[PDB]
Symmetry: D2
Subunit: 244 residues, 4 copies
């Protein structure tokens, strides 16, 4: 997370760390607990190539990355059939936990938005994660969970900003309708934050607007971070994730 | 160039090496001389972001990479307008030389293919460049120009191979129509070969079928090399490049 | 610490970690508390070149490296005058803390051996530290304190081993008299443990036999770890460290 | 070679490049031809740990590092028995070529200084090599052979500087008697030059004053380059290398 501060010990009870079997289960992406047995994350964290579930393990919310690990195995990985590359969109995926978790005040789910929310500019949205604090500036130990308040931005205004300084004709759409932009030159999600959540407090309830997807560098001018529009994949998600 | 051998001192007269002003003008992509004044290459080598022409410079064909440079400045860079990402297609771009070249036996142009030629499997095709001799295995000095003979693949079988081991549904074309495939587990282009020419001998003559675009690594099984199908952009090329 | 295990949360009270002011106060060497206001460590961790005290910092014994840092600043650095290189010997130094520490069950001084001791082969000795667990294999997070039990080796046997496979004449001494050897092809200290302690349980008492000084790699055949022999610099240590 | 320029195609006929069989025979040190069948180089380049001659190979003087290689195998390697560390001394070794060379105007031997010769402060001495051009700044291809003119410095003055900014006592001698100093903050030998010649023109003749040995960084303040004193090991050199 570029900019921001260390999230208070009881702030994002839905945050989860996706780990791989390295020399040690090393954090490779984030995700959010949307149902006691399902995790929502970016497909590019686990695709397009098939991953062996043994190599994967989930860590629910924790204030400092490796200090109190309690790795949960995954039972099934579901990546969107249209996903190939983040720039092409559809960068989203579900990880089914082998066993349901026991929700509490410190670990409980995030609410998906209704298929009628647009998350216009002005909304108080936040991105959270344990990713780099700047370009090629990794998060120094003790790996505290950082949060940042980012500003939504009209896809159209965004798409345009992405053409400034580029050879790409304007008739060519860079920012797809299934994506959502947010951030500025000093506030942005970054490498290692992928799969994490962008949640906005709509009418008092934290809703998950998007999933950290891609971008051209961390907090670069005219290059806001791109997130997957949750509302665009609400149905697909529900094919697997029951309502309650 | 995975596989292959060092190329004869008089084999690929159209080969060029694009250089960036580093500590030195180090090579970063190849090209092909298609007109005494224009260089054909992959857009991804010089785009989508705008590049400083002074920071660029073209080196004509040579047997050993930095022994006898004779750098030529580039007058204009013309990246295809629909280009944003290699996977998305349109990975082609043109470079106009400030000054023409005095063609010879060791350095002359390559014949573009006719708009009809499809280069079906069975054609003898070669790829040329100074790139990695395997994944993360950089070409050792004296940096000899290597050539390798690759087998052409039909796009539908190429697309099919690409779906093997991938979560990406089959109704999702991974290998577009403006792309071509060539290569196998022991023969293929690799990092640093991008922008290079895939040429085939069609009826006793060397035509350039494709420009080294992307791939999922180097010489990996079921992930053959993707090249920009030249015939597709034949028109566009000609809009800038005069005939002869 | 190559080989071994994670140490008990109440095992090595004298352990300290030296921190350099970087992006964060990173650990660069171990060190021991031998007096509530004096830290004993290897000269190479802080010399021969003069270091600035504002950049150096001592952290007391902690189970996991960066979790609950409580940095203490250093008042003075006293390297041994005869020091320039580890191989040449005299690899020892003292760090005067700014303020005395409040000794407890978890954090208290280690007993310096009497000038009479030798710690002959067969001594139950242990080395502890937060270093590499193998050559080029850094300590994976959460950085637990490790401990490994190592066999003391007689100098003359150790010097012979150091000649096996080397060009250096036998008459030439590699292992000096102010050095001590301990370890084998499976248990040894490593990069990062430098400056730490090698304590032995002498007649029901923990005595610091040496300081992790140098070696030709971690746990390598015919190259056991070389430690500074403390009895040798006792009088020197005492010119600054009050008795009790 | 920090500072200096590319040496003329006929300036250092005695120059040689030592090569280790890697992915390719990479230059790891320089040396000099002191007799048609022996090469003199710094011991640390080939010791103290025994090396396999099948992996070493000597390339004679060549203007550009890998372009026109002609590797010669070694028959015997003789490391001075007192060697173990450069800071300790006796950094000198001899490689015997399998066959005598055919010396010529471009490739022939250098003259060894007479026992008397001292090389007073200010001497017109030169260092030549294909090493780093600055700390951590490697010599970029085409790897020209570089040279630089460095001023000799008296051992007692040089040793004085090696104490400036260092804890080491003035009573402790850092710059040993079998070493020699040369260079300054903008002209100095560097990483990869080890073993190369330090020749001085003394009364019309180029005499090999020293051998690049060690130093605390390249072109660093109060840390002039330390070379091995040749006059010092003459007798030994001659115990193997015949006179003429
Ligand atoms: C993701 O962290 C990659 C990623 C995501 C988002 C941004 C951004 N600037 N918004 C940069 C990088 C991963 O895959 O590690
Ligand atoms: C290109 O060389 C990248 C590149 C090109 C081709 C392949 C391949 N497997 N055919 C892999 C990578 C560059 O950008 O340097
Ligand atoms: C020390 O840790 C260096 C060091 C010390 C000891 C050994 C060993 N094999 N016993 C290897 C390396 C430092 O300077 O970090
Ligand atoms: C030598 O090149 C190491 C070396 C020698 C001398 C200097 C110097 N500044 N005089 C720097 C480095 C090797 O072992 O590669």
């Amino acid at each position: 997370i570029v900019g921001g501060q260390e999230a208070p010990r009881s702030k994002w009870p839905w945050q989860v760390s996706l780990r791989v079997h390295g020399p040690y289960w090393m954090h490779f992406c984030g995700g959010s607990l949307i149902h006691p047995q399902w995790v929502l994350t970016a497909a590019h964290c686990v695709g397009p190539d098939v991953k062996d579930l043994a190599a994967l393990r989930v860590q629910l919310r924790e204030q400092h990355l490796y200090y109190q690990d309690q790795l949960l195995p995954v039972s099934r990985i579901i990546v969107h059939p249209q996903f190939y590359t983040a720039q092409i969109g559809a960068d989203i995926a579900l990880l089914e936990l082998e066993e349901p978790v026991k929700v509490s005040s410190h670990v409980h789910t995030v609410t998906l938005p209704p298929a009628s929310e647009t998350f216009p500019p002005g909304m108080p949205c936040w991105v959270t994660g344990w990713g780099d604090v700047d370009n090629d500036e990794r998060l120094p130990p003790p790996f505290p969970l950082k949060q940042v308040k980012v500003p939504i931005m009209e896809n159209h205004i965004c798409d345009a900003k992405y053409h400034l300084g580029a050879y790409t004709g304007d008739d060519v759409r860079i920012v797809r309708d299934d994506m959502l932009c947010a951030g500025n030159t000093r506030r942005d999600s970054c490498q290692g934050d992928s799969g994490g959540p962008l949640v906005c407090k709509v009418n008092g309830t934290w809703l998950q607007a998007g999933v950290v997807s891609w971008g051209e560098g961390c907090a670069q001018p005219n290059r806001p971070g791109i997130y997957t529009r949750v509302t665009y994949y609400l149905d697909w998600i529900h094919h697997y994730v029951p309502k309650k």
